[PDB]
């Protein structure tokens, strides 16, 4: 049930011993899913399996870059199985893999509760793939999931976040910024990225760039430095959050943005990937439709000492970007400051 990211898979029907295939090596929406005898190197018979929310999988064709789908979102017996572009919010594109005792799988629609099937128990080339109600004895509903060779995934080196700078003396000049370090990344399939180098060409995109890397880079930025006299109160203002421009870059690239609660706000072609994104980039799922904006905060500092007190304030900066196989960036990064992750450092220490 834990299939491998970047492993090419073929689906061998128990009854026919023939393979899930896209009719005519077609690239377009609504192209028929059929069975066809084993071919040594036809990409139309190979699929990536990408894990989705709630332990479903996307079945992504290596020729088309489109996914296994139910024609017209039908819930009935005999409804046709086709390919269609990954939408995210289409339950007919989500598949649950039930393992049987002999190692075959039954492949159940999230939408319909019916399973992949060969129409009429047919054994011939080009026999149609449909959905049918789950049946205890129906070898036409059983598929062997066979590894057909794995593809290298992009990678980047991660490390711990820099610590917040501290005063050793009242005279120390604390840095404007710490080193920028990658604290997390996640590998997402091409279905997850709208890349202007490919536009709507899903076939060319999956052939050249089947997997992208979403990178999270973080550092501390100094907002304020001041030395308070004894008895001094120092008041100041900060601007935090994210530019509308940067939210638009996130939305058009990976179809998520930053919620007002600092969580990931998922919609469209990022739906189904909320668990992977939140877990692997170590950021909560947003509990709000409200989007983070630039906001102004008011701050005060009072000096509790009978001597001068040095004061700096640091805020956590997070930059996200999407990296191609070839190391280039899709669109541009988006950058936020988190008002809920700010630290004051003083000398003497408080
Ligand atoms: Ca079909």
Author numbering: 5 to 354
The authors write:
Tpp80Aa1 from Bacillus thuringiensis is a Toxin_10 family protein (Tpp) with reported action against Culex mosquitoes. We report the first crystal structure of Tpp80Aa1 at a resolution of 1.8 Å, which shows Tpp80Aa1 consists of two domains: an N-terminal β-trefoil domain resembling a ricin B lectin and a C-terminal putative pore-forming domain sharing structural similarity with the aerolysin family. Here, we demonstrate an expanded target range, showing Tpp80Aa1 is also active against the larvae of Anopheles gambiae and Aedes aegypti mosquitoes.
Our final model had an Rwork/Rfree of 0.17/0.21 at 1.8 Å resolution and showed Tpp80Aa1 packs into the crystal lattice as homodimers, which could be indexed in the monoclinic space group C 1 2 1. The electron density map showed continuous density for residues 5–355 of the 373 aa wild-type Tpp80 protein sequence. Within each Tpp80Aa1 monomer, two distinct conserved domains appear: an N-terminal ricin B-lectin domain (IPR035992) spanning residues 5–155, and a C-terminal Toxin_10 domain (IPR008872) spanning residues 156–355. In the Tpp80Aa1 homodimer structure we also see the presence of two calcium ions (1 per monomer) and five buffer molecules present in the crystallization solution; four bis-tris propane and one citrate. Whereas the large Tpp1/Tpp2 interface may be preserved in solution, this is unlikely to be the case for the Tpp80Aa1 dimer—indeed SEC indicates Tpp80Aa1 is largely monomeric in solution. As Tpp80Aa1 does not need a partner to elicit toxicity, it is possible this ‘X’ shape is a requirement for packing and stability in the crystal structure. In Tpp80Aa1 we see a similar conservation (D73, Y88, S96, and E97) where the sidechains superimpose with those present in Tpp78Aa1, and we propose this as the putative galactose binding site of Tpp80Aa1.
